[PDB]
RNA sequence: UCGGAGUACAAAAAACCCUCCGAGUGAUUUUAAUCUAGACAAACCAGUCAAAAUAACCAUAACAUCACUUAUUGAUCCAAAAUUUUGAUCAACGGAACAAGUUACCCUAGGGAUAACAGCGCAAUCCUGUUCUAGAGUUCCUAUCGACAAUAGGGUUUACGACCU
RNA sequence: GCCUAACGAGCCUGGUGAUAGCUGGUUGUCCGAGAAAGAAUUUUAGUUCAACCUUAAAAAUACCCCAAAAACCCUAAAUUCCA
């Protein structure tokens, strides 16, 4: 089965608190082929709001988006078309969340 | 092609050309279409017509056929009753 | 091997003249495997489904309502099963005729 | 089943011929064709068998 | 044509279900 | 790369969800109708109507008319309802219907039509034949007063001029009988114009017969400005159109400017612009009646040019443009021999130095 | 050799000992003419459409149809026919008119354009470690092991590639 | 196996300047422009056609190109065509 980054593999509900489920779910997560985490609704929305807040905080004027879309420095030559969507956050099958 | 013959030291003509083409004096060569007698029952009326035509050769072929043919075949001929005398000169050609 | 003979050249189906071009009568406007473009005004249909200009003029493309010939079973069935507000649309090619049909000249004054 | 290529001749007395694929196990073929010399639609009957 | 505003104007099959 | 539709897409309205509960036209014909209605609407995408000349499309019409007759809606409605009650009532009529034997008294229908919606039909015929385009240039009028024109072909023979009809110049050799209905405080002007067939001037026309200050229905009593001149198309050109115009005027108008000599066989003297002529007298004259006919050259016309106008007779052809041939090539490739004949000048051998 | 779909996402074109379906014809009668503007396609050969005009027929009467319709095919020469045509699993399908094995008894011309040895690349296979513990260990995960899996390295093996000779 | 130091068929002369799509070689100076492969082929170690290119010569538009325009279920970067 193909799995793209950002997709939920397994969904656990219950009368549980997040912490127990987290404890054993992180094992499974660790034994998956891709890098993966254990998350709750709270944790997920937390990291998404953090993700966008990081990108409206950004001090340097120069973002991958701004440069790629406008083809500055003729940079499109080295980029893939898909990059216009991926915005330097995804490279191959790898996803680095730190990338704004 | 023989460029220098043995006996005469002249340049021979390739007769196989003289049998299937016709040289107008303008330099245009004329030929029959290929397979025009072949398997007629199997072909469209339209296609049959397209085959029955007499057609002209492109430049490359024309130069080739010229090289394969001596000077005699390029002379201006006046034949009595000739169908093709009408077609020997070129008119209104702006080039 | 298992797989064989996938090899055949492209048929060069496509559209030969484009909107706004000038054409002379008999020019092939487009050629196609299935009807993609339908013939419009002053455009003849070939038996291979290709479109050619019947008049000298300018090529125009257009979307229009499609009302199939009642002798054609399939198309009538397709039309008949449509919801009551619906109307089939298709894409057409026309030639807007350029030259006047002919002129009146003075032959002789008797 | 095989078909057959037969030569068909005008009854218009004009020598004129056209060849036709016809079913082998069928009857001797007879048609109404166009004869160019008489410029008419006339009756053609199969004279000969050309190809098999 | 995909690029144009008029794209899919001739689209029908979703109106009639024959399968 | 998707673009965004500009305005509504055609079928976007109906619900795809639950197709089975939607009503369909199982009729081919219903579909055909709906389609022809859809083809008459002003869409936002390139369409046939757009390129093929709806002829100015939307046009605000300057109208120089006679004011439409004022009639009570409700009263008329009542009367008609009644008449149809009476007509439906009879058993005789129903017998006539089931057994497929009935006839309509065409003369009466023609009278009613002349009286009622006739003016509009005559109008759109005039629009079709471009009367309005060549006369008043922008202007449409409804022919409120019916105009009856006829010619005498013999003692017992009468050739009517309806709108758009064909008449032979032989028939038209004499001035026609003219009839319309008005009481007299009235003053009218009648005009006969040849719309095309002016030889020198594409934008101008010929006055044939112009009559003025016409009391009531009395035709001959009016002073004739331009005496009747028989129709004279030219041999080559087909179907010139002649126009009978009828203006209702208030004041008596006198024009020495428009008056022509009594014989007046000069063509430069009859040269006319209906537009200008109307501009002049615009205040008093309001165009009312219209009837016109199509006319092609016939034998009798020859007599005119020689005998009256003291001219030679011009004859025309219809000349089609020469066929288009591509630039000639030095080595036409794969082209039939007869190719060389397309660029041939004339069929005749030419032996240059020989 | 020929065709349809993908590869080749929207004009065209576009490869693989690439992925998949087919063709080497039936059946039928509407037996489907002559001539010619202009074009498509295209190295060439071959392929395709087609107005007007003639002639056929209702007395202003020219698209053979169906099977996914697309493919159902073959040049010159030469043979048979006599008036106008017909003939190739020429399927190595642009086609030599007609010809098989074997050589370690071999020869010559070349090739690192191409194999066997070795190197190099790579790491499927191989070898090391760590990560994760269900389980074995009487009880007890990690004394000794450790399935399902994870991360990273090594460059012994068999291959793979054909880059130096 | 042997047949005058090399015999899967001797040696010598002639045919002979055999024929090699294969390897090697191919001799003054300076200047102008300048090329990576579509098609057939007992063809893929080669040819012959195209496309490019060179040298002359005739011309007139040539690239660049905004709308408008190019399909039917879903479909991107973008193409085509043009003032
Ligand atoms: N089938 C056929 N064979 C031909 C043709 N032209 C020449 N031939 C050859 O002519 C020869 C006739 O003798 P056969 O071998 O048939 O008895 C054969 O070698 C054949 O290949 C042709 O056009 N068709
Ligand atoms: Mg393919
Ligand atoms: Mg190919
Ligand atoms: Mg082309
Ligand atoms: Mg015709
Ligand atoms: Mg071969
Ligand atoms: Mg081959
Ligand atoms: Mg080929
Ligand atoms: Mg040979
Ligand atoms: Mg041994
Ligand atoms: Mg050797
Ligand atoms: Mg190598
Ligand atoms: Mg190589
Ligand atoms: Mg060795
Ligand atoms: Mg080894
Ligand atoms: Mg070694
Ligand atoms: Mg090795
Ligand atoms: Mg080494
Ligand atoms: Mg490694
Ligand atoms: Mg245990
Ligand atoms: Mg992991
Ligand atoms: Mg080593
Ligand atoms: Mg490997
Ligand atoms: Mg390589
Ligand atoms: Mg010896
Ligand atoms: Mg040599
Ligand atoms: Mg070679
Ligand atoms: Mg270079
Ligand atoms: Mg061969
Ligand atoms: Mg070359
Ligand atoms: Mg544009
Ligand atoms: Mg331009």
């Amino acid at each position: 089965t193909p799995v793209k980054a950002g997709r939920l593999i397994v969904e656990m509900g219950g009368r549980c608190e997040f912490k127990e489920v987290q404890g054993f779910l992180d094992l499974v997560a660790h034994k998956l082929p891709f890098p993966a985490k254990a998350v709750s609704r709270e944790t997920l929305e937390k990291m998404r709001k953090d993700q966008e807040e990081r990108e409206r905080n950004n001090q340097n004027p120069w973002t991958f988006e701004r440069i790629a879309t406008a083809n500055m420095l003729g940079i499109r030559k080295v980029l893939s078309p898909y990059d216009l969507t991926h915005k330097g956050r995804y490279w191959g099958k790898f996803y680095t969340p730190e990338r704004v | 092609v023989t460029y220098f013959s043995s006996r005469k030291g002249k340049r021979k003509t390739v007769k196989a050309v003289i049998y299937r083409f016709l040289r107008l004096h303008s330099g245009l060569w004329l030929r029959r279409k290929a397979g025009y007698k072949k398997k007629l029952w199997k072909k469209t009326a339209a296609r049959k017509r397209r085959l029955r035509e007499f057609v002209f050769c492109n430049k490359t072929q024309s130069k080739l056929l010229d090289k394969m043919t001596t000077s005699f075949w390029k002379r201006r001929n006046w034949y009595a009753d000739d169908p093709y005398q009408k077609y020997q000169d070129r008119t209104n050609l702006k080039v | 091997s298992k797989n064989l003979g996938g090899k055949s050249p492209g048929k060069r189906f496509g559209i030969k003249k484009m909107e706004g071009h000038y054409v002379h009568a008999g020019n092939i406007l487009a050629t196609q495997r299935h009807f993609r473009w339908h013939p419009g005004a002053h455009v003849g249909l070939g038996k291979n489904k290709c479109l050619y200009a019947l008049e000298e003029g300018v090529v125009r493309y257009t979307k229009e309502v499609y009302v199939p010939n009642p002798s054609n079973s399939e198309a009538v069935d397709l039309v008949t099963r449509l919801p009551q507000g619906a109307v089939l649309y298709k894409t057409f090619v026309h030639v807007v005729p350029a030259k006047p049909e002919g002129t009146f000249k003075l032959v002789a004054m008797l | 089943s095989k078909t057959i290529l037969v030569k068909m001749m005008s009854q218009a007395g004009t020598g004129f011929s056209f060849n036709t694929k016809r079913s082998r196990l069928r009857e001797k073929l007879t048609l109404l064709h166009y004869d160019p010399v008489v410029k008419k639609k006339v009756l053609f009957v199969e004279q000969k068998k050309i190809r098999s | 044509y995909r690029s144009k505003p008029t794209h899919g104007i001739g689209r029908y099959k979703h109106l009639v279900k024959a399968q | 790369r998707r673009a965004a539709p500009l305005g509504p897409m055609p079928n976007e309205d109906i619900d795809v969800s639950d197709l089975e509960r939607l009503k369909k036209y199982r009729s081919f014909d219903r579909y055909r109708r709906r389609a022809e209605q859809e083809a008459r609407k002003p869409h936002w995408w390139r369409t046939y109507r757009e390129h093929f000349g709806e002829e100015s499309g939307p046009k605000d019409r300057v109208d120089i008319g006679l004011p439409p007759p004022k009639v009570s809606r409700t009263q008329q409605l009542l009367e008609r309802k009644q008449a149809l009650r009476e007509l439906r009532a009879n058993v005789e009529e129903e017998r006539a219907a089931r057994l497929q034997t009935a006839r309509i008294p065409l003369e009466a229908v023609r009278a009613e039509w002349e009286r009622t919606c006739g003016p509009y039909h005559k109008q759109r015929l005039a629009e079709y034949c471009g009367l309005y385009r060549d006369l008043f240039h922008g202007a449409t009028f409804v022919p409120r007063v019916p105009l009856h024109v006829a010619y005498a072909v013999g003692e017992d023979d009468l050739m009517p001029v309806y709108h758009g009809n064909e008449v032979t110049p032989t028939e038209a050799a004499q001035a026609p009988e003219v009839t319309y209905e008005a009481d007299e405080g009235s003053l009218w002007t009648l005009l006969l114009t040849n719309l095309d067939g002016h030889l020198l001037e594409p934008d101008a026309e010929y006055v044939h017969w112009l009559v003025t200050n016409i009391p009531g229905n009395r035709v001959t009593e009016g002073q004739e400005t331009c005496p009747y001149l028989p129709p004279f198309p030219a041999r080559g050109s087909g179907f010139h159109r002649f126009a009978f115009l009828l203006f209702k005027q208030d004041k008596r108008i006198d024009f020495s400017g428009d008056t022509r000599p009594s014989p007046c066989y000069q063509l430069a003297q009859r040269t006319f612009h209906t537009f200008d002529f109307y501009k002049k007298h615009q205040d008093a004259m309001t165009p009312a009646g219209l009837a016109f006919f199509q006319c092609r050259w016939d034998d009798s016309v020859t007599r005119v040019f020689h005998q009256l106008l003291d001219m030679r007779e011009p004859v025309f052809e219809f000349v089609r443009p020469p066929p288009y041939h591509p630039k000639q090539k030095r080595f036409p490739h794969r082209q039939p021999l007869r190719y060389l004949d397309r660029y041939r000048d004339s069929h005749e051998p030419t032996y240059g130095i020989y």
Side-chain angles (χ1 to χ4, degrees):
Chain A
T1 316
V3 176
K4 278 173 171 177
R7 169 185 175 99
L8 304 177
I9 306 305
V10 147
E11 197 186 22
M12 282 202 52
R15 42 188 88 271
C16 266
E17 284 272 35
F18 173 63
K19 282 213 176 173
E20 35 235 344
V21 197
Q22 166 175 51
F24 78 83
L25 272 191
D26 267 338
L27 304 201
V28 189
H30 164 265
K31 285 165 81 169
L32 285 179
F34 32 90
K37 260 170 54 168
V39 294
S40 80
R41 289 175 180 270
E42 302 194 358
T43 328
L44 199 58
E45 282 199 357
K46 169 69 165 187
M47 91 172 53
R48 281 177 186 171
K49 286 182 183 176
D50 269 342
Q51 184 52 48
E52 83 153 31
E53 201 179 65
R54 277 177 80 255
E55 99 173 344
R56 80 162 192 253
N57 275 19
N58 206 145
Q59 284 309 279
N60 80 323
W62 305 115
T63 107
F64 195 100
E65 278 191 46
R66 178 187 175 190
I67 293 183
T69 66
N71 188 28
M72 306 189 73
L73 330 165
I75 232 301
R76 282 289 278 293
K77 170 155 149 289
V78 192
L79 299 190
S80 150
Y82 284 77
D83 276 334
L84 303 181
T85 284
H86 296 353
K87 307 164 177 183
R89 298 169 52 65
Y90 312 84
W91 166 247
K93 75 175 175 180
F94 288 77
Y95 156 68
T96 111
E98 329 279 338
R99 267 322 300 240
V100 163
Chain B
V1 169
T2 291
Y3 301 106
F4 298 102
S5 64
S6 183
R7 319 283 215 79
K8 273 295 157 75
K10 301 184 169 176
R11 172 196 197 106
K12 296 187 174 181
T13 222
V14 179
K15 288 288 184 199
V17 175
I18 255 43
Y19 293 146
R20 27 212 121 173
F21 299 83
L22 162 68
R23 192 190 131 88
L24 313 180
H25 186 84
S26 170
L28 298 195
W29 288 83
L30 193 74
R31 68 163 230 250
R32 222 84 150 77
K33 215 94 165 56
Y36 84 98
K37 304 159 63 179
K38 272 297 184 60
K39 298 177 190 297
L40 291 198
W41 62 269
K42 197 196 279 200
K43 293 179 184 193
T44 311
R47 191 179 172 189
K48 261 177 257 190
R49 174 133 40 259
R50 244 176 274 128
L51 292 182
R52 259 179 282 108
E53 297 285 353
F54 298 73
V55 292
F56 288 122
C57 316
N58 74 330
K59 184 187 185 183
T60 310
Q61 287 162 358
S62 288
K63 285 189 47 181
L64 167 70
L65 292 183
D66 275 325
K67 283 190 214 163
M68 283 207 263
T69 263
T70 345
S71 152
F72 166 94
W73 298 94
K74 301 157 197 176
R75 78 188 298 268
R76 176 44 131 314
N77 284 334
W78 308 96
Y79 299 119
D81 300 333
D82 185 36
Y84 297 107
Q85 185 176 297
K86 186 188 176 186
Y87 298 110
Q88 301 257 300
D89 244 289
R90 223 96 141 65
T91 101
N92 293 345
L93 191 47
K94 295 222 168 186
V95 168
Chain C
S1 53
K2 301 212 298 182
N3 294 136
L4 287 180
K7 348 193 295 177
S8 82
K11 263 54 211 66
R12 283 110 239 252
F13 293 140
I15 142 182
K16 312 310 193 182
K17 297 306 180 85
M18 210 85 30
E19 152 103 8
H21 278 294
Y22 201 74
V23 285
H24 301 274
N27 282 350
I28 302 206
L29 302 187
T31 182
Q32 57 195 332
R33 174 144 36 227
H34 309 283
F35 288 89
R36 169 172 173 173
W37 316 277
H38 300 97
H42 303 290
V43 167
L45 174 66
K47 45 201 208 70
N48 57 38
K49 306 175 221 179
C50 91
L51 319 178
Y52 60 93
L54 292 159
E55 304 284 338
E56 163 159 332
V58 182
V59 179
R60 300 288 184 194
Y61 290 78
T62 291
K63 316 295 188 189
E64 271 171 272
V65 300
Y66 170 72
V67 187
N69 181 37
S71 299
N72 176 4
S73 67
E74 298 195 357
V76 169
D77 293 344
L78 168 64
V79 131
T80 270
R81 287 176 267 149
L82 297 163
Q84 262 220 340
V87 177
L88 250 296
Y89 276 83
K90 300 288 190 171
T91 299
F92 291 88
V93 203
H94 324 275
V95 182
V96 176
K99 308 279 191 182
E101 171 63 52
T103 329
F104 288 106
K105 288 294 177 183
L106 174 64
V107 175
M109 223 181 51
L110 301 184
Chain D
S1 65
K2 296 169 193 173
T3 50
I4 197 183
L5 184 64
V6 302
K7 175 183 190 173
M8 286 192 48
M9 192 71 49
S10 338
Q11 297 308 315
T14 287
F16 187 84
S17 313
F18 79 93
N19 326 128
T20 294
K21 220 75 182 175
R22 153 225 159 190
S23 183
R24 161 153 292 167
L25 294 176
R26 222 183 194 177
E27 47 205 11
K28 179 173 177 176
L29 186 47
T30 310
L31 298 179
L32 293 179
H33 207 74
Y34 184 98
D35 188 289
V37 180
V38 202
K39 290 187 176 188
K40 299 291 169 130
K41 188 154 183 166
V42 209
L43 184 89
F44 281 63
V45 187
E46 156 194 7
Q47 179 163 320
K48 299 173 173 181
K49 155 194 179 177
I50 298 195
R51 208 201 168 178
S52 302
Chain E
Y1 194 74
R2 307 218 257 109
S3 260
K4 289 299 189 182
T6 91
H7 185 64
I9 229 233
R11 169 192 182 188
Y12 70 88
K13 264 165 205 165
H14 70 279
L15 297 177
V16 169
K17 289 184 181 176
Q19 303 147 17
Chain F
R1 194 49 183 186
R2 264 294 181 74
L6 343 164
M9 226 49 166
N11 299 269
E12 73 186 6
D13 292 326
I14 82 259
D15 280 341
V16 185
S17 58
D18 205 325
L19 279 186
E20 193 172 354
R21 278 175 201 167
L22 285 180
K23 200 186 171 190
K24 4 259 192 193
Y25 16 49
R26 328 102 194 166
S27 139
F28 167 91
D29 212 310
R30 278 187 238 172
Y31 176 84
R32 185 180 191 235
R33 265 192 190 181
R34 181 57 189 165
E36 297 184 35
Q37 289 176 14
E38 267 292 306
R40 289 189 193 101
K41 298 178 179 182
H43 306 299
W44 54 264
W45 59 77
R46 293 312 137 276
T47 191
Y48 169 89
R49 275 173 157 187
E50 181 180 337
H51 285 113
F52 270 92
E54 208 61 55
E55 293 276 355
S56 179
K59 174 72 180 178
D60 298 324
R61 284 302 175 172
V62 209
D63 185 342
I64 34 176
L66 274 200
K70 285 184 173 177
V71 186
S72 50
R73 328 88 158 156
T74 309
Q75 197 181 78
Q76 163 208 98
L77 183 68
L78 266 180
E79 302 174 9
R80 293 189 183 174
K81 291 283 190 178
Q82 292 168 18
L84 296 181
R85 286 169 178 169
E86 304 171 13
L87 183 53
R88 180 155 305 196
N90 315 349
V91 188
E92 16 140 283
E93 296 295 327
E94 198 119 345
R95 293 178 192 185
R98 306 129 165 276
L99 309 177
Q100 312 285 15
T101 313
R103 290 286 181 181
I104 308 213
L106 300 184
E107 299 180 358
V109 210
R110 156 87 192 172
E112 260 291 350
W113 171 90
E114 191 81 284
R115 202 171 133 264
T116 312
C117 49
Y120 296 114
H121 288 203
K122 309 219 290 183
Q123 181 201 294
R124 76 180 167 191
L125 270 183
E127 253 281 337
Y128 174 51
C129 286
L131 274 293
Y132 303 136
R133 187 240 299 145
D134 276 40
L135 294 170
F136 319 93
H137 292 40
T140 315
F141 70 86
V142 200
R144 293 303 178 187
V145 305
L147 218 180
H148 299 265
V149 189
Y151 278 113
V153 211
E155 298 185 8
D156 314 326
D157 281 325
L158 213 55
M159 171 84 87
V161 173
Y162 306 98
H163 36 269
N165 187 27
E166 190 212 12
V167 196
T168 320
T170 297
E171 278 78 330
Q174 298 298 328
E177 290 72 22
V178 183
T179 302
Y180 56 94
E181 297 196 346
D183 53 85
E184 6 88 14
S186 306
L187 300 169
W188 306 81
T189 288
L190 196 72
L191 169 56
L192 179 54
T193 312
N194 183 221
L195 295 194
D196 19 76
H198 184 117
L199 311 188
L200 283 197
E201 287 185 36
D203 318 338
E205 41 199 27
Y206 284 155
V207 147
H208 278 249
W209 181 34
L210 178 56
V211 90
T212 330
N213 283 15
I214 294 290
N217 187 23
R218 301 282 174 177
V219 208
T220 327
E221 292 184 359
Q223 55 184 7
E224 62 171 15
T225 311
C226 215
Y228 185 93
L229 185 71
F232 64 119
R235 185 141 124 242
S237 36
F239 301 97
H240 306 204
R241 6 155 218 173
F242 295 88
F244 289 109
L245 285 177
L246 223 208
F247 303 83
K248 193 191 238 172
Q249 46 169 21
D250 326 319
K251 302 257 172 181
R252 281 216 152 183
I253 328 179
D254 201 316
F255 6 79
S256 49
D258 313 35
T259 311
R260 326 257 177 179
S262 25
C264 64
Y265 287 130
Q266 301 309 286
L267 285 164
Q269 290 172 6
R270 320 165 170 253
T271 291
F272 206 69
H273 303 83
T274 291
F275 194 71
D276 304 332
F277 165 86
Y278 183 83
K279 269 280 201 198
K280 271 187 158 191
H281 313 142
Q282 182 166 21
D283 292 319
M285 281 187 193
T286 307
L290 166 66
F292 68 102
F293 68 98
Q294 302 276 4
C295 177
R296 59 198 279 191
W297 179 99
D298 106 85
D299 217 330
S300 57
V301 187
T302 306
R303 283 177 179 178
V304 174
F305 286 97
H306 302 158
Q307 192 180 9
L308 302 202
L309 318 182
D310 196 354
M311 271 188 65
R312 299 184 206 169
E313 172 201 346
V315 176
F316 294 105
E317 245 315 315
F318 189 71
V319 178
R320 309 176 189 262
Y324 155 76
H325 295 302
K327 220 183 240 175
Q328 187 178 347
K329 295 193 303 175
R330 168 87 103 251
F331 287 96
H333 175 42
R334 221 119 96 64
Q335 281 284 320
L337 174 58
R338 60 190 186 262
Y339 176 95
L340 286 177
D341 271 329
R342 305 170 185 158
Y343 307 88
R344 181 93 65 192
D345 213 27
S346 59
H347 290 266
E348 287 281 9
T350 22
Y351 313 80
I353 65 190
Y354 295 103

